Design a binder for these strands. Structure first.
Lengths: 119, 43, 204, 101, 132
RNA sequence: ACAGGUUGAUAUUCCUGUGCCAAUAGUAUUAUGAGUUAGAUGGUAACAUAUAUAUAAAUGAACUCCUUUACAUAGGCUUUAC
RNA sequence: AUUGGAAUUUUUCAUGUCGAGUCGUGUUCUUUGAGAUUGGAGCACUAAUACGUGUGAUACAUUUCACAUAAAGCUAAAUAUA
RNA sequence: GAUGUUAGGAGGGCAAAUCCGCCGAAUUUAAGCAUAUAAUUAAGCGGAAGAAAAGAAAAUAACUAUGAUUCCUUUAGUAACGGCGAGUGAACAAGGACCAGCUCAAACGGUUAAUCCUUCGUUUGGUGCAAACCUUUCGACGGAAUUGUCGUUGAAUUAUUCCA
């Protein structure tokens, strides 16, 4: 029923009011389902998906706000930081790998290899 | 025995729920069952 | 100048002064905890030469190992093995006591740290006391430094338990080259597997 | 004593902690539950297994406006809580019964 | 029972005279950060390091070396009075490690050297050298 | 923590009745007895004493010393209850 | 447009240097191709400084000559993969 | 050396075919059996990686000598080892795959450690819708280290010639 972009339009108070409304409606369907009535049972799936959409949109917006809050300043909170392989995280930097002693720097700069021909 | 453990009680209730026969509608679009006297849960 | 003087002074060993100082230091070592931090190595010259660098990420640990060999493991009396096979009183097996000391620190304190090498320091007839050079792969100065930097790669987790240290190189025979190393040079495992291997072509 | 540069994680998502909707799942529909409602001012509710009595009492009062003299609970073979809730004698279970069905 | 070479490092100059020597040596303190900036911008000293000091003694470029006995390895400078005696150059064995560190703008120092000074302060250093 | 009742199936647990227990924060009021113009009393004694809706409340620190918890077997005698 | 570095090439001058309870030897146990001891290990005794000392597969003394530079460290590739 | 829920970080465990270490048997063979044999195999405990380890001479040669490592073809079922019985058993050369070098350490540099790092910051680039990464020099303020970091690879001095 409700579609993500319409929810993304909403402010946080408005989105939460919709979330609460859906919970109350969902509960009414659930009570109805628990009763001997079969009137509205199929609609519960749709509402559960609608609730899911609300929560995903609200959480994405909240996550973006958290990212906006921790824009730069070197350190985000641990699990808002880069999740990547433990090995990749451990790994020495290419920049650091590339760097070399002054005698090595002299060797590289002075003496690179060159390409060639013959007659 | 007569007194019980919450984990054991839950698993036994699960095993009972699993036990009950298949929906007949599924055959329109039953391989395993236990009987308490001849088959125990083995726990 | 200074390290060369200290080297030669330490090289004689059987001097009164050296014996006095060694006995006192060994006495102190007998008191101390099994594996313990030192601020700086007891012999700078030996340590520097065994690859110590006086930087932040380079750390010293002093380690206690008991003297002598030891009986093979058994039920009560000896196992039921062949008349050739007795592990009784002794076995005199492969790990040298320096390598054994490195293993004890390598499991107990290392993991965050990585073992670089270790030097003799001193001994009596019941314990040897060794000092182990250790290094952190995490810290910025060592990652930045182009020297030693290789140790930051993940293959250097447990170097002593792969036997890559000077002690490990010794008992694997990697110091030995030439025909004295003939059955051992690519590795004891490697050499034997190459010799064992039977290689067949498709058309033979 | 502690005062870190940042907390471990401050995760800004909506809570996964249990809520009124799901803490109380549904009123019981049995003849026994009918008899309890009729004679002794008691509403009988199915509730989550991991629910606790105070939380059930709070939930019922939030969803139904109604106060509980005692809440007696049981952990069932079907893996939920079954709550017998005696309503306070000022307000009648029958009125609430008409509201729930 | 203590061997002479080990033993000698419980013996020093007289304490007040040592303080007087230290304060005299203080005057010839090395540079700081600000001085280096000044040196670049605008348009003798106390010598440290046992490897450098031993080099100075080999080349006879020292005048007076002051050794601490409060260093944890004393071995690393144990040979130095023997060497200095053979090289016939003034050395002094002095109690406090920390104060020698202060004179070189550090938390600690093993040995410290004052290697030759201006003629007018030379005479006081010659008196110190005579005492030593 | 008991007695009676009750269900198709549970009841020391549901219901009706009667109780019992532990906690029960701060501040301000109140009532309850004390003590004051800084700590009650009797009894020779063994010992006893607050009957307030309610036997509540009978100064006491550090530091100490006890006691209950807390105990075998056998044989008879005896008292109460069912 | 400054600053800096490097390689050869002359001529002088500096001819310094090279990892010790380690090598070695003895002994013991192990191991191998190692054989009057190949590698390892325990223990005992324990070195020489570069015109040194480690090698030149039968123990040794005495002497050649050739070749190497231990006792600190790292390193892609071909190669292996049930 | 203690102590800290001080501030920042790391390790733990799993998975295992191939890899690297340890520790480490016997059934079996000899028509018996003890040395030898199975076998430095299996199991055990550890460590790694997309390959690992090994690797730049305390090497091989005795030639008209070669010249880091690995692998193959081979030497070779040979020298050799063995109750010289059963049985075990290399390496060098040659033909090739393929090939890559190097730095600590001493030594040298004191009218000045020429070093290093954390925290705070700050701007010359570049992407991407956005998240965000990536380059980029410049200053502080803390520390660390002379019990030795950084530079240098004999020393100057000439001419040449390149690179930043």
């Amino acid at each position: 029923n409700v579609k993500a972009y319409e929810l993304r339009t909403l402010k946080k108070k408005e989105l939460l009011d919709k979330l609460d409304e859906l919970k109350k409606e969902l509960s009414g369907l659930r009570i109805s389902k628990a009763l001997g009535n079969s009137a509205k049972n199929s609609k519960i799936h749709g509402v559960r998906k609608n609730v899911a959409r609300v929560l995903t949109v609200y959480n994405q917006k909240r996550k973006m706000e958290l990212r906006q809050l921790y824009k730069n300043k070197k350190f985000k909170p641990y699990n808002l930081r880069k999740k990547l392989t433990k090995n990749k995280r451990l790994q020495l930097s290419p920049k650091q790998k590339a760097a070399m002693t002054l005698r090595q720097k002299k060797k590289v700069q002075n003496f690179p290899q060159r390409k060639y021909l013959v007659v | 025995g007569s007194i019980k453990r919450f984990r054991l009680k839950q698993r036994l209730g699960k095993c009972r729920r699993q036990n009950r026969p298949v929906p007949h509608w599924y055959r329109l679009k039953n391989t395993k069952r236990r009987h308490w006297r001849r088959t125990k849960l083995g726990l | 100048g200074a390290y060369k003087y200290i080297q030669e002074i330490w090289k004689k060993k059987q001097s009164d002064a050296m014996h006095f100082l060694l006995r006192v230091r060994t006495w102190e070592y007998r008191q101390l905890p099994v594996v313990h931090r030192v601020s700086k190595p007891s012999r700078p010259d030996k340590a520097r030469r065994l690859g110590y660098k006086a930087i932040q990420g380079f750390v010293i640990y002093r380690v206690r190992v008991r003297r002598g060999d030891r009986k093979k493991r058994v039920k009560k009396g000896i196992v039921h093995g062949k008349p050739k096979h007795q592990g009784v009183h002794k076995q005199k097996s492969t790990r040298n006591l320096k390598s054994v000391a490195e293993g004890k620190v390598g499991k107990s304190i290392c993991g965050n740290l990585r073992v670089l090498n270790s030097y003799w320091v001193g001994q009596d007839a019941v314990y040897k006391y060794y000092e182990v050079i250790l290094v952190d792969p995490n810290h910025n100065a060592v990652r930045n430094n182009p020297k030693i930097n290789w140790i930051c790669n993940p293959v250097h987790k447990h170097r002593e338990l792969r036997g890559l240290t000077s002690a490990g190189k010794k008992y694997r025979g990697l110091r030995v080259k030439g025909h004295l190393s003939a059955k051992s040079r690519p590795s004891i495992r490697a050499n034997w597997k190459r010799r064992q291997l039977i290689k067949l072509r498709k058309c033979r | 004593a502690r005062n870190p540069k940042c907390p471990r994680i401050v995760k800004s998502c909506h809570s996964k902690t249990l809520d009124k909707y799901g803490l109380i799942k549904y009123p019981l529909t049995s003849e026994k539950a009918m008899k309890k409602i009729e004679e002794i001012n008691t509403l009988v509710f199915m509730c989550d297994k991991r629910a606790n009595k105070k939380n059930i009492k709070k939930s019922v009062k939030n969803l139904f406006g109604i106060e509980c003299d005692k809440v007696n609970v049981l952990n069932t073979l079907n893996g939920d809580k079954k709550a017998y809730v005696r309503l306070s004698g000022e307000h009648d279970a029958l009125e609430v019964a008409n509201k729930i069905g | 029972k203590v061997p002479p070479s080990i033993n000698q490092f419980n013996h020093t100059l007289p304490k007040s005279q040592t303080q007087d020597l230290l304060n005299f040596l203080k005057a010839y303190k090395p540079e700081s950060k600000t001085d280096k900036k000044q040196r670049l911008l605008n348009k003798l000293f106390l010598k440290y390091g046992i490897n450098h000091i031993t080099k100075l003694v080999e080349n006879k470029k020292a005048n007076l070396v002051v050794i601490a006995n409060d260093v944890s390895p004393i071995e690393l400078v144990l040979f130095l009075p023997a060497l200095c005696r053979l090289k016939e150059v003034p050395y002094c064995i002095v109690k406090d490690k920390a104060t020698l560190g202060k004179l070189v703008h550090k938390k600690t120092a093993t040995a410290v050297c004052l290697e030759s000074v201006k003629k007018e302060d030379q005479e006081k250093l010659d008196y110190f050298a005579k005492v030593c």
